[PDB]
Amino acid sequence: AELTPEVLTVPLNSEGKTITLTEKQYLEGKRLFQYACASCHVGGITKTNPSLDLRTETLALATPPRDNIEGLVDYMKNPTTYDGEQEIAEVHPSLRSADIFPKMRNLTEKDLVAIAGHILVEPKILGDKWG
Numbered sequence: 001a002e003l004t005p006e007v008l009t010v011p012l013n014s015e016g017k018t019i020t021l022t023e024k025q026y027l028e029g030k031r032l033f034q035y036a037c038a039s040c041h042v043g044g045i046t047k048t049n050p051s052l053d054l055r056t057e058t059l060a061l062a063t064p065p066r067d068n069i070e071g072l073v074d075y076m077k078n079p080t081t082y083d084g085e086q087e088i089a090e091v092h093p094s095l096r097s098a099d100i101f102p103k104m105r106n107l108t109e110k111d112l113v114a115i116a117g118h119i120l121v122e123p124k125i126l127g128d129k130w131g
């Protein structure tokens with residue numbers, strides 16, 4: 001609904017720690033996600049591979065868990081297959097493949113956190129519309 005505490009608060013790691021994103025992080029997240037991710041994940045979907053969307057439940061069942069800030073930031077640095085067995089930076093934009101995916105060259109740690117925050121917050125605002 002509105003940017004209330006539960007909407008802005010998401011898991012920071014898989015151990016249970018949480019983080020309450022700021023309104024500024026919320027706005028930065030929308031800007032950055034549109035810039036570097038929307039081309040393939042607009043609205044939470046995943047073009048070319050619909051089943052591996054950005055819905056929170058889908059991320060929670062990924063390996064390692066991607067339903068928390070650290071897990072998503074880690075994915076943006078070193079993306080892996082859903083079972084976490086193989087790294088896929090050559091196909092998936094990441095800091096490790098920033099040479100062939102230029103838009104990733106300009107992302108700071110703070111930017112990565114904001115983008116991760118966007119992914120975890122949106123479904124709480126859009127419900128099923130996300131994904």
Ligand code: HEC
Nearest residue numbers: 036037039040049052053054058059062066075081082093
């Ligand atoms: C298209 C060229 C892409 C861009 C730009 C970004 N992502 Fe992506 N992402 C893409 C594909 C084809 C896939 C599936 C890869 C596979 O495992 O075969 C993904 C997957 C993700 C996931 C995992 C989803 C899940 O486990 O359910 C995440 C967390 C993800 N992508 C995040 C993400 C972010 C934050 C991006 C912007 C910085 C981004 N992706 C861009 C294709 C593309």
